[PDB]
Design an enzyme around this catalytic site. Structure first.
Site, mmCIF file in Angstrom:
data_model
loop_
_atom_site.group_PDB
_atom_site.id
_atom_site.type_symbol
_atom_site.label_atom_id
_atom_site.label_comp_id
_atom_site.label_asym_id
_atom_site.label_seq_id
_atom_site.Cartn_x
_atom_site.Cartn_y
_atom_site.Cartn_z
ATOM 1 N N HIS A 65 0.790 -1.232 0.000
ATOM 2 C CA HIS A 65 0.000 0.000 0.000
ATOM 3 C C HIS A 65 0.829 1.293 0.000
ATOM 4 O O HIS A 65 0.216 2.345 -0.189
ATOM 5 C CB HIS A 65 -0.996 0.080 1.165
ATOM 6 C CG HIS A 65 -0.388 -0.249 2.506
ATOM 7 N ND1 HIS A 65 -0.367 -1.544 3.005
ATOM 8 C CD2 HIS A 65 0.169 0.534 3.477
ATOM 9 C CE1 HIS A 65 0.239 -1.556 4.184
ATOM 10 N NE2 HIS A 65 0.558 -0.306 4.502
ATOM 11 N N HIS A 94 6.801 6.769 5.391
ATOM 12 C CA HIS A 94 6.169 6.239 4.153
ATOM 13 C C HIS A 94 5.461 7.332 3.438
ATOM 14 O O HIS A 94 5.448 8.499 3.889
ATOM 15 C CB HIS A 94 5.182 5.127 4.540
ATOM 16 C CG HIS A 94 4.079 5.620 5.428
ATOM 17 N ND1 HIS A 94 4.181 5.584 6.821
ATOM 18 C CD2 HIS A 94 2.894 6.237 5.140
ATOM 19 C CE1 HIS A 94 3.084 6.139 7.351
ATOM 20 N NE2 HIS A 94 2.281 6.541 6.358
ATOM 21 N N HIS A 96 2.299 8.894 0.526
ATOM 22 C CA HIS A 96 0.914 8.881 -0.061
ATOM 23 C C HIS A 96 0.989 9.755 -1.289
ATOM 24 O O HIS A 96 1.433 10.903 -1.241
ATOM 25 C CB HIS A 96 -0.079 9.453 0.926
ATOM 26 C CG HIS A 96 -0.096 8.670 2.224
ATOM 27 N ND1 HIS A 96 -0.858 7.532 2.376
ATOM 28 C CD2 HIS A 96 0.611 8.816 3.376
ATOM 29 C CE1 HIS A 96 -0.654 7.017 3.580
ATOM 30 N NE2 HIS A 96 0.221 7.787 4.212
ATOM 31 N N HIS A 119 5.103 10.754 5.594
ATOM 32 C CA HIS A 119 4.760 10.591 7.017
ATOM 33 C C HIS A 119 5.961 10.041 7.710
ATOM 34 O O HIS A 119 6.335 8.885 7.449
ATOM 35 C CB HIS A 119 3.526 9.723 7.229
ATOM 36 C CG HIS A 119 2.292 10.425 6.806
ATOM 37 N ND1 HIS A 119 1.094 9.782 6.537
ATOM 38 C CD2 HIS A 119 2.042 11.751 6.697
ATOM 39 C CE1 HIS A 119 0.177 10.685 6.236
ATOM 40 N NE2 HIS A 119 0.715 11.883 6.331
ATOM 41 N N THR A 208 -3.775 6.844 9.704
ATOM 42 C CA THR A 208 -4.680 7.010 8.532
ATOM 43 C C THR A 208 -4.868 5.729 7.769
ATOM 44 O O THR A 208 -5.441 5.759 6.669
ATOM 45 C CB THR A 208 -4.186 8.092 7.549
ATOM 46 O OG1 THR A 208 -2.963 7.631 6.975
ATOM 47 C CG2 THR A 208 -3.927 9.440 8.256
ATOM 48 N N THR A 209 -4.424 4.616 8.334
ATOM 49 C CA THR A 209 -4.773 3.305 7.792
ATOM 50 C C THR A 209 -5.312 2.471 8.948
ATOM 51 O O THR A 209 -5.029 2.795 10.122
ATOM 52 C CB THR A 209 -3.563 2.590 7.161
ATOM 53 O OG1 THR A 209 -2.464 2.560 8.082
ATOM 54 C CG2 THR A 209 -3.033 3.369 5.911
HETATM 55 ZN ZN LIG Z 1 0.773 7.737 6.232
#
Ligand SMILES: [Zn+2]
Ligand SMILES: CC(=O)N[C@@H]1[C@@H](O)[C@H](O)[C@@H](CO)O[C@H]1O
Ligand SMILES: CC(=O)N[C@@H]1[C@@H](O)[C@H](O)[C@@H](CO)O[C@H]1O
Length: 277
Positions: A65, A94, A96, A119, A208-209
């Site tokens: 992801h 990581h 986005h 992030h 946020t996951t």
């Molecule tokens: Zn994140």
């Protein structure tokens, strides 16, 4: 099972599949609204610093992801109070991003989406001995959000990819999940110097996951660091995991959450910081 792009397991479903805690009312990301926020002059400049005697390797993984850089323990830290005494210890960074250049960030600033939001995830070592103790406990985490914006004219050395050392070239179509590779360390101090480390939004929110735990102290810097279209398309060459409907990784961002959903039992406030003038 969760995903971004499979409508069955996608972000609209998370409040049901992961009621704890994706159904909560302190969720992230939110729209960072400059006019609604409260300026708090007590919020100091952020410092990121390294234990210069640490030698372990850094790695990166395509976890299906995102692309997630995993830092060795006891190596990179954040200070929010100017003292370098290891209160927050960085775990991973990581990213986005979007299928197109006009979306990709999870937060928005006054409604505006950036192409790529990084992030930097840390745990409050002041209180908790290890990432795994902190990750599911109250007040365990603090995340820095770094917005990136695309420029047409720029030297490599001026772009965020200099701090990232191009992720050692790992961003390409053959970096399939769940491969991980050793990479050159990320110079996070340099990355932070590419923006204003005193100018940020600050609020209490969530991962946020899934499982969206509400134990994240958020700091989202207002000024973006700079990248090129070539560099954003690198991330776009990564394949998505097999949970996803889309083949190429992109639009791996959660939709916007309200600062205070209607059901809240104690309203939260969005704060803003700026340099001592
Ligand atoms: Zn994140
Ligand atoms: C975490 C911290 O504050 N300092 C660490 C120390 O504990 C460790 O033995 C050393 C060598 O790797 O790296 C430094
Ligand atoms: C040291 C390193 O790996 N950095 C390379 C840089 O030398 C190169 O000019 C650029 C090519 O896009 O990307 C990156």
């Amino acid at each position: 099972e969760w995903s971004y792009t499979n409508i069955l397991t996608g972000p609209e479903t998370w409040h049901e599949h992961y009621k704890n805690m994706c159904s909560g009312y302190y969720q992230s990301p939110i729209d960072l609204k400059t006019d609604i926020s409260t300026l708090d002059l007590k919020l100091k400049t952020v410092i990121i610093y390294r234990n210069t005697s640490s030698t372990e390797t850094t790695t990166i993984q395509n976890n299906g992801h995102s692309a997630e850089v995993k830092f060795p323990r006891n190596t990179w830290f954040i200070s929010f109070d100017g003292i370098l005494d290891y209160k927050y210890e960085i775990i991973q960074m990581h990213f986005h991003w979007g299928n197109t250049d006009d979306r990709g960030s999870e937060h928005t600033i006054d409604g505006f989406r950036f192409p790529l939001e990084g992030h930097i995830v840390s745990f409050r070592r002041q209180m908790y001995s290890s990432p795994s103790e902190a990750i599911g406990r109250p007040g365990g985490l603090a995340v820095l959000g770094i917005m990136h914006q695309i420029v047409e004219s720029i030297k490599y050395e001026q772009t965020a990819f200099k701090a990232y050392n191009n992720f050692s070239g790992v961003l390409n179509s053959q970096f399939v999940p769940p491969n991980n590779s050793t990479i050159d360390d990320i110079n996070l101090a340099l990355l932070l110097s590419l923006l204003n480390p005193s100018r940020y939004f600050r609020y209490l929110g969530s991962l946020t996951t899934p499982p969206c735990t509400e134990n994240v102290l958020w700091t989202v810097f207002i000024d973006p660091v700079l990248i090129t279209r070539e560099q954003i398309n690198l991330f776009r060459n990564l394949p998505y995991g097999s949970n996803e409907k889309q083949t190429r990784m992109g639009d791996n961002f959660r939709p916007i959450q309200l600062l205070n959903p209607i059901d809240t039992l104690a309203s939260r406030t969005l704060y803003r910081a700026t340099a001592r003038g």
